[PDB]
Amino acid sequence: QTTTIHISAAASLKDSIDDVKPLFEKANPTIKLSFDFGGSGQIRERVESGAPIDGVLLASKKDADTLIKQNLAEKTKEFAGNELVLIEPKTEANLEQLLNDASKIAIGDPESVPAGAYAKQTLENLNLYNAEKAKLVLATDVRQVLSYVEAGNADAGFVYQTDALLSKKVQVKAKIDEKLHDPIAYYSAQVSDSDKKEETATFLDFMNKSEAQKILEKYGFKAAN
Numbered sequence: 001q002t003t004t005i006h007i008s009a010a011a012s013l014k015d016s017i018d019d020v021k022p023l024f025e026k027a028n029p030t031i032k033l034s035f036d037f038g039g040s041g042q043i044r045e046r047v048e049s050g051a052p053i054d055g056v057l058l059a060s061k062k063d064a065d066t067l068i069k070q071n072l073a074e075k076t077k078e079f080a081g082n083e084l085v086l087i088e089p090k091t092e093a094n095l096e097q098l099l100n101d102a103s104k105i106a107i108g109d110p111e112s113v114p115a116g117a118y119a120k121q122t123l124e125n126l127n128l129y130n131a132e133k134a135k136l137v138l139a140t141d142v143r144q145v146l147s148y149v150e151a152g153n154a155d156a157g158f159v160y161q162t163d164a165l166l167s168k169k170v171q172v173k174a175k176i177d178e179k180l181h182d183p184i185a186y187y188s189a190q191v192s193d194s195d196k197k198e199e200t201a202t203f204l205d206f207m208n209k210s211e212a213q214k215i216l217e218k219y220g221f222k223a224a225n
């Protein structure tokens with residue numbers, strides 16, 4: 001018979017998973033997928049609260065290590081990478097000058113969103129955090145940061161390179177140097193309390209196979225280092 005498993009993936013994987021799901025369910029007619037997308041840190045809190053999730057897809061090695069240490073997750077596996085960029089709504093201005101003219105700079109919540117955590121490490125390592133400290137607006141996930149800059153409600157925003165590629169309404173004004181922050185790597189894990197570990201193991205391994213790896217490449221994502 002059919003079996004439904006629920007995966008909690010990061011918000012930055014919303015559009016690439018849209019194409020992975022039909023290819024997986026075709027190759028596995030007995031496993032059906034249910035996805036919820038949001039900030040990885042908030043996905044971490046729900047697993048730590050007893051949420052009935054089978055597997056998770058997180059954009060932070062820190063959030064994955066946290067679930068492993070509490071024996072809430074198991075079998076971690078990096079499957080993708082990404083880069084951080086500064087986007088503005090649609091002059092040879094530098095990053096500091098872009099943040100000077102900006103009145104609202106949208107970043108993910110550094111306490112529950114990796115994209116906001118990577119963006120904070122960039123500003124700290126550039127000696128720019130305290131300068132733009134009072135102008136930051138925290139969001140629920142990186143896709144919310146994209147929605148604010150798209151609508152013009154925010155002057156600048158920090159999103160992933162894959163997020164800016166999917167938007168005609170914004171444009172990249174600065175590519176954050178990858179050394180200015182911890183490596184952006186996506187990880188897959190299995191919630192230990194899941195009753196469907198066999199079925200969830202099929203999908204989590206499917207992400208590291210050739211079919212899912214090419215979807216990430218064509219969507220701008222990077223590979224596991």
Ligand SMILES: [Ca+2]
Binds near residue numbers: 096
């Ligand atoms: Ca300066």
Ligand SMILES: [Ca+2]
Binds near residue numbers: 134135136
């Ligand atoms: Ca303010």
Ligand SMILES: [Ca+2]
Binds near residue numbers: 193194195
């Ligand atoms: Ca159980």
Ligand SMILES: [Ca+2]
Binds near residue numbers: 195196197198
């Ligand atoms: Ca079972």
